[PDB]
């Protein structure tokens, strides 16, 4: 029956309520109880506040009216306002004090997730103060999680006027009985109730959520910790840079602040960072999540040498040039991890800081052919399997769904051993035709990859592995250097190929290296442990790249 | 005969030379003359400096070696280094002191422009100091103006070694006699001379330029002030954001720093900002230059109401949302100018600051139909001509080259009077079939527009003018507000439609409005007076949006 949930901003989705700083200021300043609310409300439907909430005047135009109102109320109550009494001041402080009320957001999220239409309906103002960006950030962070945002100052109406609930219903395309509406002010609930909506009077969040859980029959309280926000590909800004005649690179771009360039591994996609993109943008960074050469909407030339680290790096430098970026932070995973280390070593002036997930920095051994280094570790056998052009292409391209469903698995779910892959004749010789879905991925997500890999297949991706000798030789040039810019190595306990201990000597080459470590996490780090990854990158970004 | 010009960075394209801070420090500190150069050069082809210039070690690895060298030299010369003597310090200061030597750059530019291949060949280092971004910015700013940049620490060779000149020649695809090479160190010139290249020993810039002028037979000295850097469209980052199902917006994106959204007028293009894009990126801003709805690579739905200011504004807000931008500075021209004022008035929380070129802010007159306001001013007659769907489309689309060549003209070149356009039956009824090129535009540039307008024609663009009543009504809602965020109005003396005096009352609505004014400039402001526009926007950005 109930099919839509409507939340207010002040006192419901965001706390402490700004209305409530009137009360607190009165106490703090020993003013007559209610004096400030009286001034805030003076003239009712015709006073300054209502004009403000209706969008007739801006906040800065309103501030002096409220001032005058406060003086009127203090005269009539035969008291004085303190020296330095400042409405601008009180409101600047209250508006920045207000934060998202996380449990209310997650309940709205869960309801949206079980099929509800969700809306914010709020009495709010046109904000033109010096410090307005603060409110603009909050609204941006909230509005994305809801179907609609209805703001009194944009529609020219205000709660409790009946017309705005009529507008609400009309916006929702629902009848009154299908809607639950939550508000911290009872007077605002009343016209929703008149129409026969379920209403919830929000005092403490937990009680309100109990009421909401009861009435919708969905669990909202005591729910497991949810995944971070993901990315819907068709809501992203898609960017395209031609770095040379036959090579253009695609990336997705979110946020502002220092530039953070995300570099995925084999055989993945920008979308491999879908959990980190909003989190890092939210944390104050300009995230550029690439399709690396060979992938997705980037160019995929056929020749092997187009994919040697030297050419790949120079292309990433050009990509910075053409975007007008003097540096970026480079964060990589798997092959992307390898590339960012080399960016640190050959272009430190372009790298604000470097981090790798799973991929350790190992210097070339000048006395040992790289092919032999690889034959030393049985778990790298899959890399020899990738050498002969066509062989791996045929297996990986035969059945795309099957490929990604077999590869993208958590530590406890794996179906393919990297063990004697050449000998067995292939990577999937002993895995199902129809693999079960890993807990890490949905069917929709697997299909995104499938669709990406239909444009170019696996020749470009595989070529990344086909320049061992060439990379070795270019790497030998850097054996005298150290990496001395800010640097983070994140090891993944259950990555049975890029094992943690493979990173154990890195400090000899990177003396001030910082570490994070993630337990119970396999090779597909970002999707396996997205919360831990986000926490480790943001903490490291905030302290080292800023 | 001469077909290529090769410039060094230190002492030639950039001044003061860092080599020269060794000399100055010696004097400042009363050290033995040459003591620091001796330490810098110690061990010659096998000392630390050469290893550095070859890319064997990074700058920060080198710093302690130079330190040790300085101590060695002071011992042997039986002197003391002062307390607090610091190579890190001396080099941090010298490297930031160094700036582009503008007259050398403009000569390289002019030579490139007359057909030369141009290169930078420099002995330089891998820079990993905390303050490396400074050097990275310089190199970015220089490297874009040349065909090649050859850096000793990337190719593993150094001037004066013969092999690097061989590499140079090979990179240029020219023989030695076709090349002029300039350097401030004679020893570096010598192997170029051995090969039969023209060399110039650069001491003062002006004398070097005289030599270069003589030997190439091109004027380099005393040349008129050149246009600002323009944009080559296929070197830009192209961005695409879907703001709703049938509407995607395209923009070009350059630089980092605060977000600056450029909004063009009718009937133009992102490319209408080609002169401002590099200048504003260079000044430390993240420039997003749009194709506005209706244009270029943005969507162009046919319905008139898709182009009313309300819908246009809401779409620009969504565009910020999807890019994760809480605000941007909005700068508009002509119709774009109108749109940014309305962004200021309905979304001040999203606008860091607002500026308009030519378009004044005029409030709706609540007592006068907007069609009548327009019939009041004979110079707006062209706007009535634009009302009837199809009529203007047919004339403007008949011959695209002719259209843009007729419209894009400087104040003294105009062929079309906005005077009684309806009566004459059209905007071009009394202009040539083949108009001459305006001084403001090349044939190539006109063709870019032509090509842009072949995708959607003029229906979308013209629809911007077809919502007078609808815009009037939405504008009436804002008649109580003022614009109180940072705001700049730039008037164009010879814009005979958007005349300066049309802005004369703006201060009543925008009390702290700032102004710039440009003389001898018609309607096509950005291309007419690109230097003045750049100077006025950057000065206003730096003081009001930062
Ligand atoms: O290591 C694992 O957990 C599973 N795995 C599958 C592949 Br392909 C790899 C290579 C590191 C890229 N690892
Ligand atoms: O005013 C001028 O200088 C020439 N001109 C041509 C046109 Br269409 C216009 C309208 C302001 C857009 N002006
Ligand atoms: Mg409330
Ligand atoms: Mg020099």
Swiss-Prot record, chains A, B:
Domain (AB hydrolase-1): residue spans on this chain: 258-530
EC number: 3.3.2.10, 3.1.3.76
Impact reported for residue 286 to Q: No effect on phosphatase activity; decreased epoxyde hydrolase activity
Principal subcellular localization: cytoplasm
Region (Phosphatase): 1-223
GO CC aspect terms: cytosol; extracellular exosome; peroxisomal matrix; peroxisome
Key word Phosphoprotein present: yes
Primary enzyme class: hydrolase
Active site annotation, chain numbering: 334 (nucleophile), 465 (proton donor), 523 (proton acceptor)
Catalysed reaction, written as an equation: an epoxide + H2O = an ethanediol; (9S,10S)-10-hydroxy-9-(phosphooxy)octadecanoate + H2O = (9S,10S)-9,10-dihydroxyoctadecanoate + phosphate; 12-phosphooxy-(9Z)-octadecenoate + H2O = 12-hydroxy-(9Z)-octadecenoate + phosphate; 12-phosphooxy-(9E)-octadecenoate + H2O = 12-hydroxy-(9E)-octadecenoate + phosphate
Residue span of region Epoxide hydrolase: 234-546
Effect annotated for changing residue 54 to R: Decreased phosphatase activity; no effect on epoxyde hydrolase activity
Subcellular location as annotated: Cytoplasm; Peroxisome
Binding residue positions for phosphate: 122-123
Quaternary structure note: Homodimer.
Name the UniProt record assigns to this protein: Bifunctional epoxide hydrolase 2
Organism: Homo sapiens
């Amino acid at each position: 029956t109930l099919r839509a949930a409507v939340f207010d901003l002040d006192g419901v989705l965001a706390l402490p309520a700004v209305f409530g700083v009137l009360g607190r200021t009165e106490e703090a300043l020993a003013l007559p109880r209610g004096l400030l609310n009286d001034a805030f409300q003076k003239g009712g439907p015709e006073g300054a506040t209502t004009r403000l909430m209706k969008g007739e005047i801006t906040l800065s135009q309103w501030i002096p009216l409220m001032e005058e109102n406060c003086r009127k109320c203090s005269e009539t109550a035969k008291v004085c306002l303190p020296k330095n009494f400042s409405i601008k001041e009180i409101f600047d402080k209250a508006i920045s004090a207000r934060k998202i009320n996380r449990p209310m957001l997650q309940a709205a999220l869960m309801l949206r997730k079980k099929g509800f239409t969700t809306a914010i309906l709020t009495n709010t103002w046109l904000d033109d103060r010096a410090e307005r960006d603060g409110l603009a950030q909050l609204m941006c962070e909230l509005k994305m999680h809801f179907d609609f945002l209805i703001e009194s100052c944009q529609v020219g109406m205000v709660k409790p006027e009946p017309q705005i609930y009529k507008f609400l219903l009309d916006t929702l395309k629902a009848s009154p009985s299908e809607v639950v509406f939550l508000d911290d002010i009872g007077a605002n609930l009343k016209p929703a109730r008149d129409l026969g909506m379920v209403t919830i009077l929000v005092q403490d969040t937990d009680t309100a959520l109990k009421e909401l859980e009861k009435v919708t029959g969905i669990q909202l309280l005591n729910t497991p910790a949810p995944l971070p926000t993901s990315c819907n590909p068709s809501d992203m800004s898609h960017g395209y840079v031609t770095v040379k005649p036959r090579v253009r690179l695609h990336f997705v771009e979110l946020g502002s602040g220092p530039a953070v360039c995300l570099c995925h591994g084999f055989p993945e996609s920008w979308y491999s960072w879908r959990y980190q993109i909003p989190a890092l943008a939210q944390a104050g960074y300009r995230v550029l999540a690439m399709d690396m050469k060979g992938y997705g909407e980037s160019s995929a030339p056929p020749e092997i040498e187009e994919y040697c680290m030297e050419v790949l790096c120079k292309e990433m430098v050009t990509f910075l040039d053409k975007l007008g970026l003097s540096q970026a932070v480079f964060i990589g995973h798997d092959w992307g991890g390898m590339l960012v280390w080399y960016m640190a070593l050959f272009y430190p002036e372009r790298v604000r800081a470097v981090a790798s997930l799973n991929t350790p920095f190992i210097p070339a051994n000048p006395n040992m052919s790289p092919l032999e280094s690889i034959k030393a570790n049985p778990v790298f056998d899959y890399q020899l399997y990738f050498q002969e052009p066509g062989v791996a292409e045929a297996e990986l391209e035969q059945n795309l769904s099957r490929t990604f469903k077999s590869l993208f698995r958590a530590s406890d779910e794996s179906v393919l051993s990297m063990h004697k892959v050449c000998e067995a004749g292939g990577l999937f010789v002993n895995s199902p035709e129809e693999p079960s879905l890993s807990r890490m991925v949905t069917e929709e997500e697997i299909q995104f990859y499938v669709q990406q890999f239909k444009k170019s297949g696996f020749r470009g991706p595989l070529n990344w592995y086909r320049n061992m000798e060439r990379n070795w030789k270019w790497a030998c040039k850097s054996l005298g250097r150290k990496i001395l810019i800010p640097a983070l190595m994140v090891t993944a306990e259950k990555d049975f190929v890029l094992v943690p201990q493979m990173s154990q000597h890195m400090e000899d080459w990177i003396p001030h290296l910082k570490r994070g470590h993630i337990e119970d996490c396999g090779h597909w780090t970002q999707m396996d442990k997205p919360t831990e990854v986000n926490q480790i990158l943001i903490k490291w970004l905030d302290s080292d790249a800023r």
